[PDB]
Amino acid sequence: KPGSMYRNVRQRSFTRRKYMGGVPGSQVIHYDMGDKANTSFPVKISLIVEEKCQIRHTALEAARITANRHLVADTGKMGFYMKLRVYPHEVIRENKSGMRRAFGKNVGTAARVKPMQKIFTVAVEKQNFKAAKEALWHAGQKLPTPCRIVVDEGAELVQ
């Protein structure tokens, strides 16, 4: 089931899980990566999406896996702090016959994100800025939206 199916945002938010049945939970494991204690990272960059899209939990997990592996192989295991801001709260339901009784079963969750809303926030040192930026570039290739990187902290620290 490709991500083009559950991508466009034309339906309201289906998140109240006490009035639905049996949501298969997200495959996304963690939401904080790297040094979860050092708040003294001067250069901080964030990956933002520039469309209104619904990111599946599997897409978020794949993007997090590629970004975290690239950052661990670039800046060491404790030379970065990467934050996946958005939780997949929407429940995605598929009509698994014909169109009679078409309200489908829940087949997974997803996160509805607005334009310019940050997905990943990465805090790195001065020298590891390029590796973090390039890993965030690899992260957005696994997402269903055009993504552009924006610098949070230390804009003067880079150029």
Partner RNA sequence: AGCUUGUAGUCCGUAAGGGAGACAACCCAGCCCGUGGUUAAGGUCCCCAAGUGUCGACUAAGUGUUAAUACUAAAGGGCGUCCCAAGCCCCAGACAGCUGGAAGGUUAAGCACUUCAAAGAGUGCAGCUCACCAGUCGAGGUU
Partner RNA sequence: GCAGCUUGCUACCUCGAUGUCGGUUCUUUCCAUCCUGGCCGUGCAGCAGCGGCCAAGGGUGAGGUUGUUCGCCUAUUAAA
Partner RNA sequence: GCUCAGGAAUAAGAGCUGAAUGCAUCUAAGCUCGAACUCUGACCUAAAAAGAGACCUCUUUAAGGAUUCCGGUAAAAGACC
Smallest distance, RNA to C-beta of residue 35, A: 26
Smallest distance, RNA to C-beta of residue 4, A: 4
Residues between 92 and 151 that touch RNA (CB under 7 A): 97-100, 137, 140-141, 146-147
Structure tokens at 7: 């991508």
Given 4, 18, 19, 39, the residue binding RNA (CB under 7 A): 4
Smallest distance, RNA to C-beta of residue 3, A: 8
Structure tokens at 106: 């829940």
DSSP string, the chain: --TTTT-B--S-----GGGS--PPPP----SEEE-SS----SEEEEEEE-S-EEEEHHHHHHHHHHHHHHHHHHH-TTSEEEEE-----EEEEE---TTTT---EEEEEEEEE-TTEEEEEEEE-STTHHHHHHHHHHHHTTSSS-EEEEEEE-HHHH-
Number of residues interacting with RNA: please give it, by CB under 7 A.
12
Site string for RNA, 61-100 (x = CB under 7 A): ------------------------------------xxxx
Judged by beta carbon, residue 86 or residue 139, the one nearer RNA is 139
Judged by beta carbon, residue 37 or residue 99, the one nearer RNA is 99
**For binding to RNA (CB under 7 A), which residues are involved?**
2, 4, 97-100, 137, 140-141, 146-147, 159
